[PDB]
Amino acid sequence: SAGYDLSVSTFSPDGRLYQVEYIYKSINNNNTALCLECKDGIICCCINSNMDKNKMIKKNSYNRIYHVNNNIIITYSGFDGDARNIIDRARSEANTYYYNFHTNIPLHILVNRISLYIHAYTLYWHMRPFAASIIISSFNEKDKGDIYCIEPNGACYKYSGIVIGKNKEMFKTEIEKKDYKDINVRDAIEDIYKFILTSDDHMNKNNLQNLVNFSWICKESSYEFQNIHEEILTPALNKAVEYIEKL
Amino acid sequence: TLGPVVTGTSVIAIKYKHGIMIAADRKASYGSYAKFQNVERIFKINNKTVMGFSGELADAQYLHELLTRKNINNLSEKKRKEDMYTPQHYHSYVSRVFYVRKNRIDPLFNNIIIAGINSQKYDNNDDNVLLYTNKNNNNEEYKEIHKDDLYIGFVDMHGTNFCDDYITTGYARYFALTLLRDHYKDNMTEEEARILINECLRILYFRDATSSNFIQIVKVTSKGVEYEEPYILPCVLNSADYVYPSTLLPPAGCMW
């Protein structure tokens, strides 16, 4: 602070940009999103636990998982409007790439372009920086999984599994126990439900159905985007719930 | 574009009892030169919509790009199968593009056919769309689709647009259309529709210099958009007088 935290274009005397750190705090307070690489696909999950008191919301109507070309998963934690802005930009870059080259934009190039777009809103004294971190991921047989997470400061890193948003540390502690590169996405579903039950103290076995978005790109879906059907999420939810209530 | 340079000739699209059957020979000519003989001229827009073109190939490829990305963005926002754009929607979009370009005196040198299935009640293909995989190439039967649920639209260079039970472009507007107005009927089977389309294409082969007999057939049905295996159409002359030698005719006079 000390007057150096009122603008995203002023460095503090210790070399820090405080508006960016305040955005980070906002994101860490927001809902949880995670993406996990498995043996035959990637699995993404958003836990909308901030909406637990919103009883009148239409069941399963709030979804934070989108896709780019029907084969890239993009999700976020942070402001919905800013995330929609960034997703629109991602799709616009994909359209432009196809128009120019007649092939789909590679994942890593798209990540670089999105991160540059985000970074450009941290440079001027009259623009609000985006308050959202983005997960962008794909999967195909030959390359296996690619998961990138873009920060509000504009830094993109590559992960085997990522958790952003609230309670991310506990989720990471649970995620890191098992090597999911040798587990199948279907089997990972139950693990994820168990992790949700433990880590998010606002989530119980009653609102697990209406507060969690599940999507994947896997062999079963021909390596194209798909929301996991309730006929697959139901047995996994029941099993996680009974196992947890046992202990 | 200032005028046609590389052109495709003619497309035929008709409704039959299981959906749309659209045909075009796989030929693109450089003037009177048949430079390309294996050209695709019918494109898939989505699982229920196809685009055929005659005229300039570059303009047709431009339009195909536009529609490909339009369908992609449609799928990006989809939350239920009803949200997918209908053939009527794409026909309106193409008619609008053409109208705007006419007003600038900058038209695409094409005639376009937009055809497909205008309903979502006959199957659940748009529940999980695959852009880069095809599962048809399971052992289910076609659904009879009511004619009113099928759509065949036409757009020309000036933006003229309309719909009908059968649409033709190019020389099919004379040769094929005559036989269709004479002989088309509702609820034809795939066999009858194919026979009629083949008769039209045979006449075109015999009377249109730009045409070929290597025919691509595409079907839009409850199973989605299906590309049939291209096939050579057998075209034999319908009179022995053509084959009679000239030397057997009288040598005197204008005998030729």
In a domain, B78, yes or no: yes
Q: What gap in Å lies between CA B75 and CA B69, rounded to an integer? A: 10
Instruction: Select from B65, B132, B137 the residue whose CB has the most chain A CBs within 10 Å, as the one to mutate to test that interface.
Output: B132
Q: Do B69 and A95 touch (CB under 8 A)?
A: yes
C-alpha distances in Å from residue A98, one per residue of A92, B45, B64: 10, 15, 12
In a domain, B248, yes or no: no
**Would you call A115 helix, strand, or coil by DSSP?**
helix
Cβ–Cβ < 8 Å for A166, A203: no
Q: Which two tokens stand for residue B15?
A: 């409704």
Q: What gap in Å lies between CA B161 and CA B171, rounded to an integer? A: 18
In a domain, A26, yes or no: yes
Tell me whether residue B1 is one of the annotated catalytic residues.
Answer: yes
**Closest A-chain CA to B64:** A99
Residue located via tokens 């199968």: B81
Q: Do A95 and B68 touch (CB under 8 A)?
A: no
Output the domain CATH number for residue A81.
Answer: 3.60.20.10
**The one catalytic residue among B1, B68, B169, B210:** B1
In a domain, A139, yes or no: yes
Nearest to B24 by CA among B180, B183, B204, B189: B204
In a domain, A102, yes or no: yes
Nearest CA distance, B69 vs chain A (angstrom): 6
In a domain, A207, yes or no: yes
Question: Domain count of chain A?
Answer: 1
CB-closest option in A66, A69, A223 to B72: A69
Q: What gap in Å lies between CA B48 and CA B87, rounded to an integer? A: 7
In a domain, A123, yes or no: yes
Rounded to an integer, what is the distance from CA B14 to the centroid of its chain?
A: 9
Q: What gap in Å lies between CA A96 and CA B93, rounded to an integer? A: 20
Q: Do B130 and A95 touch (CB under 8 A)?
A: no
Instruction: Select from A95, A104, A141 the residue whose CB has the most chain B CBs within 10 Å, as the one to mutate to test that interface.
Output: A95
Q: Do B133 and A222 touch (CB under 8 A)?
A: yes
Residue located via tokens 């802005």: A85
Question: Domain count of chain B?
Answer: 1
Resolution (A): 2.2
Structure-determination technique: cryo-EM
Nearest CA distance, B72 vs chain A (angstrom): 7
In a domain, B111, yes or no: yes
Q: What are phi and psi of B136, to 5 degrees?
A: -65, -40
Cβ–Cβ < 8 Å for B180, B189: no
Q: What gap in Å lies between CA B144 and CA B16, rounded to an integer? A: 9
